[PDB]
Amino acid sequence: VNSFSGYLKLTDNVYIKNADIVEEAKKVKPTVVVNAANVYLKHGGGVAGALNKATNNAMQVESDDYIATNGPLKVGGSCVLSGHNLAKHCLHVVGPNVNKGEDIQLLKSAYENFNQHEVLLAPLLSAGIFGADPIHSLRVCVDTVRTNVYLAVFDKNLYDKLVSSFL
């Protein structure tokens, strides 16, 4: 028994809610919150810019040191950094950017990173400003992640659409 509240159960291991991931994180303080990162860990908008603002820019400061030491992530890759005031850890995961010509099959690789963590609070990936279809994306999540994932969907019309169209 964990502390997530109000989620709809989609499968044995996937749960969903119409919620802002930042508000969910502040309330639950989960072991792992997933960020929808880019390869440079430049947190400008969407999930990344909202989480980072909620950390008072501490996430960006930590991220810039990570990049200076290690170089960029791979599309489909991830790194574990601090969760600051939002979670114990933040798993920064890079989904493909279809508006950069990046292969959408890399979305499955991106979700595979979630399997290294028993429980996660996460958004939908190479959703929002990353330009992917949020049906196909939910489907890849369900068919790839085997650990327990709590999805926070910010847009109400996407959520109602995702739930009503979920096979």
Binding site for ligand WW4 (CB under 6 A): 20-22, 46-47, 50, 123-124, 127-129, 152, 154-155, 158
Which 8-state DSSP code applies to residue 31?
S
Which of residues 68 and 111 has its CB atom nearest to ligand WW4 in the complex?
111
The enclosing H or E element of 35 equals: strand 32-37
User: Could you tell me the smallest distance in angstroms from the CB atom of residue 7 to ligand WW4?
Assistant: 14
User: Could you tell me the smallest distance in angstroms from the CB atom of residue 82 to ligand WW4?
Assistant: 19
Which of residues 69 and 133 has its CB atom nearest to ligand WW4 in the complex?
133
Of 1, 4, 41, which Cα lies nearest the Cα of 122? 4
Which of residues 69 and 157 has its CB atom nearest to ligand WW4 in the complex?
157
Which of residues 4 and 154 has its CB atom nearest to ligand WW4 in the complex?
154
User: Starting at the edge strand that comes first in sequence, how are the strands of the sheet with 14-18 ordered?
Assistant: 8-9, 14-18, 148-153, 119-122, 32-37, 89-94, 78-82
Q: Which residue is nearest to ligand WW4, using beta carbons?
A: 128
User: Could you tell me the smallest distance in angstroms from the CB atom of residue 68 to ligand WW4?
Assistant: 27
Alpha helices (H) along the chain: 21-28, 46-54, 58-70, 106-112, 134-144, 156-164
User: Could you tell me the smallest distance in angstroms from the CB atom of residue 42 to ligand WW4?
Assistant: 15
Who's near 130: CB < 8 A, 6+ residues apart? 36, 46, 95, 96, 97, 98, 99
Which of residues 158 and 163 has its CB atom nearest to ligand WW4 in the complex?
158
User: Could you tell me the smallest distance in angstroms from the CB atom of residue 71 to ligand WW4?
Assistant: 26
